[PDB]
Design a binder for this molecule. Structure first.
Ligand SMILES: Cc1cc(C)n(-c2ccc(N)cc2)n1
Length: 298
């Protein structure tokens, strides 16, 4: 019943794979007609990762309205998120147009541009103050104002300008730079410290448009972030924080975008994250670092 006691039983039985396969079989199926049009082929990273028609974000400019991006509206938790793929070389302008039009304050990135020698996302933001980016197709300018590089994540201040009007906005870029090449993090401490920094910035407040969250495909790591955040919000709002069933929250999220959480390891990490996050919020600091054995395994 208590989330933590369910966790212990699933670990003892080795039943993470079976639970993850039940989720896959139970998940919603809705049409993705627009994503599958032939003119949109070069706007999708993968043929089998598409936004549903009912929840897709529409671009407003005169032109093709299509971006691979979904609005996740969690009504009981009172938060929304846009989940999207990492931009491609030809959809960086579309990505910033969406940020502009939806009034987002924050962008959350859960991957590196290159991983295991392969390109996972385009370089969609400027690395140097003095070398701004212009997106000619969507008439947007983007400048790096500052950045703060820490061991597990980096936080940037960006200035986004609509060149049609000369209106400008400050956008916060939260970049988790240490997700492992294979699997999931051993400990959720650094992920939680990252989530709490995002919250602390004000970027998730209802004063703003939905935060934009992405990885490479916009379903696996991205899913973990949004699922952890929403379960923690529900634990604070409910009379009994043990009422929170992670599996039922995840199926709810999957009405808005397919494939959220892509492996049994991602499922187990999300549970671990919520359990530790709740402990921390309730007054246990021992969860905020990982203890290391003296070893030289590499
Ligand atoms: C559903 C629902 C109800 C509310 C207040 N939001 C929401 C939308 C956007 C942000 N940034 C925060 C919250 N989503």
């Amino acid at each position: 019943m208590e989330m933590e006691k369910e966790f212990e039983q699933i670990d003892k039985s080795g039943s993470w794979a079976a639970i993850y396969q039940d989720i896959r079989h139970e998940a919603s199926d809705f049409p993705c007609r627009v994503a599958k049009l032939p003119k949109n082929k070069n706007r999708n990273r993968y043929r089998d990762v598409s936004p549903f028609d009912h929840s897709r974000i529409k671009l407003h400019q005169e032109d093709n309205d299509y971006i691979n991006a979904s609005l996740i509206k969690m009504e009981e938790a009172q938060r929304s998120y846009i989940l999207t793929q990492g931009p491609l070389p030809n959809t960086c302008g579309h990505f910033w147009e969406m940020v502009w039009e939806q009034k987002s304050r924050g962008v959350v990135m859960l991957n590196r541009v290159m991983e295991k020698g392969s390109l996972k996302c385009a370089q969609y933001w400027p690395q140097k103050e003095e070398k701004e980016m212009i997106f000619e197709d969507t008439n947007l300018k983007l400048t790096l104002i500052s950045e703060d590089i820490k061991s597990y994540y980096t936080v940037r201040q960006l200035e986004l300008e609509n060149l049609t009007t000369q209106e400008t906005r400050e956008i916060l870029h939260f970049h988790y730079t240490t997700w492992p090449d294979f699997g999931v993090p051993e400990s959720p401490a650094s992920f939680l410290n990252f989530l709490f920094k995002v919250r602390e910035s004000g970027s998730l407040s209802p004063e703003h448009g939905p935060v934009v969250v992405h990885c490479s495909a916009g379903i696996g790591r991205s899913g973990t972030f949004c699922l952890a955040d929403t379960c923690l919000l529900l634990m604070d709002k409910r009379k009994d924080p043990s009422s929170v069933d992670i599996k039922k929250v995840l199926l709810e999220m999957r009405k808005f975008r397919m494939g959220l959480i892509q492996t049994a390891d991602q499922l187990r990490f999300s549970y671990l994250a919520v359990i530790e996050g709740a402990k921390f919020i309730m007054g246990d600091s021992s969860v905020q670092d990982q203890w290391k054995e003296l070893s030289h395994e590499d």
